[PDB]
Structure formats: structure tokens, C-alpha cells
């Protein structure tokens, strides 16, 4: 979707091993705020609606 009618699904209650992104090597602007890319794996919250 777009930025004017974006959806916000529920991101929790499901396996999210974000290392599945860290072998991407094809991104351009992977940025993380309030957390480093590494330390969102050991600890990462609920209500993480994407």
C-alpha cells in the first residue's frame, strides 16, 4: 500500500527471527531506531505493528 492509506497489521504471536533480514545484502536503507540491528534479536517487543 501507500503512505496515505497504509495498513497496520499486528506483529506479535508469531516467530520473527530478524536474522532472516541480515543475510539480505541487497537492501539500501536498513535503519533501526531505539535499537541497533543486532540487539533487536535478543530482545524485541510486542505491539510491533508493521
Amino acid at each position, epitope marked *: 500500500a501507500s503512505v496515505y492509506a497504509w495498513n497496520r497489521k499486528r506483529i506479535s504471536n508469531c516467530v520473527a527471527d530478524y536474522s532472516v533480514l541480515y*543475510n539480505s545484502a541487497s537492501f*539500501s*536503507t536498513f535503519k533501526c*531506531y531505539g535499537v541497533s540491528p543486532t540487539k533487536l534479536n535478543d530482545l524485541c517487543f510486542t505491539n510491533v505493528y508493521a
Partner: nanobody
Amino acid sequence: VQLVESGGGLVQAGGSLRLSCAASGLTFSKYAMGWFRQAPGKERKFVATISWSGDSAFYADSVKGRFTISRDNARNTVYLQMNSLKPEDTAVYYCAADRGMGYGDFMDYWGQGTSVTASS
């Protein structure tokens, strides 16, 4: 505002190579630093990036074991060591900085780009 590339890949034989950029326009411990490259024909691709203060470092899938993105919080300088020079590393390199954790097609400050190339 100042982030300039220097050095080169002017090598007559294989060996260890170094790049010596400088960050002298704004802070260097806040702006997470990065290092990209554009091959002569291939596009700008990720090489290395660092955390805000240099606390986290990671590389690509083919440069991790032979590169060294060294930053310098003090004396305003930054280097990128290229080791075990390979023909797949011909490019023009750029030192960079951003408010995230590096790794952005558009940075806060962009380097000029020095030509590094390995020929054997």
C-alpha cells in the same frame, strides 16, 4: 559538511591496501559512519557500515573477512583497509555518515570517492 576521499588502488602488484578519508565538517560520534563503493559499471553497493559511536560493525557477504572499516572519533579521520586484493573490488569508494546506522542510499554527508582497483 566535510567528508573527503583520498588514496587509490594504484597498485603495481597485489598486497594490502588502505583508504584514508576524513570527517571534518560535523560530529563523527553521532553520525553513524559508512563506506560504499560504485564499480565502474556496477551501481553503488554496500561495503561496510558502523554504529553511532563505532560500537557495532558488520560487512557484506564477500568483504567481511578481508576489510577493515576503521573509524577515528579523535583527530577526525577514518580509514578502510582492503586486504587480499581481488579483481572483484574495482570501484570508486565513498566515506559517508547518516543519522541511522549508516547503510543508506542517501546519507547525511557523502564522500567524493577515491578509485581503488586490484589488478594482477
